[PDB]
């Protein structure tokens, strides 16, 4: 979710790709992630090229978590459900907003909702694409490197823009 510039925009939707349009100077991505009946994350990221490399630098602050809730109690399964990211323009800031719901599977079979609210604004002075409403269809697979003993995550993700004819 951090480098949505890697989404596949169908050719007929390429005029709606804010994320690539802000490159190489990049964008600021901010979120509030509200865990139902628990705490929240606030995140601020700068996504930009450093040479030929796409860099995502993030500061994350979490408050109001329950000591024995699903987050600090580590009660969430190591897996991930498919979801859509709903994007709208934010013309007043020459960027975009997004909203979506993540459902984290709890180890008892229940679900921990994480409501996501997102804002992105360009860093540079080049023109950017302000999109019509659409969404990103996202599928993610989490795994472990069997030779890795540090605490780690391996992620494979596929993202495709959709919602416009």
């Amino acid at each position: 979710s951090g480098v949505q510039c890697f989404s596949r925009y169908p050719d007929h939707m390429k005029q709606h790709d804010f994320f690539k349009s802000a490159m190489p100077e990049g964008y600021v991505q901010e979120r509030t992630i509200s865990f139902k009946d628990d705490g929240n994350y606030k995140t601020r990221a700068e996504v930009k090229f450093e040479g030929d490399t796409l860099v995502n630098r993030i500061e994350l602050k979490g408050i109001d978590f329950k000591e024995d809730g699903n987050i600090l109690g580590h009660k969430l399964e190591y897996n991930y459900n498919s979801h859509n990211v709903y994007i709208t323009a934010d013309k007043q800031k020459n960027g975009i907003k997004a909203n979506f719901k993540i459902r984290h599977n709890i180890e008892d079979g229940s679900v921990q909702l994480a409501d996501h609210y997102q804002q992105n604004t360009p860093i540079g002075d080049g023109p950017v694409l302000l999109p019509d409403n659409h969404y990103l269809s996202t599928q993610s697979a989490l795994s472990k490197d069997p030779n890795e003993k540090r605490d780690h995550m391996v992620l494979l993700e596929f993202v495709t823009a959709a919602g416009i004819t």
Binding site: S1, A45, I58, G126, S140, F158
Partner: protein
């Protein structure tokens, strides 16, 4: 857009996070690559400060 010509091939990715959740401070470093032609991302993340104080899935949208 001009920016999109930057994405027609495989692009290396670096991710760096500093976190503080309920006073539990931690950092994560990630590496991998993306291929927007296919909407495809592959990344590996390491908690560089020791054990991650929150579940990895809760960081996917931030780091991925």
């Amino acid at each position: 857009s001009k920016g999109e010509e930057l994405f027609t091939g495989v692009v290396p990715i670096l991710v760096e996070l500093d976190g503080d959740v309920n006073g539990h401070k931690f950092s994560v470093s990630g590496e991998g690559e993306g291929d927007a032609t296919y909407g495809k991302l592959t990344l590996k993340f390491i908690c560089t400060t020791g054990k991650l104080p929150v579940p990895w899935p809760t960081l996917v949208t931030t780091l991925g």
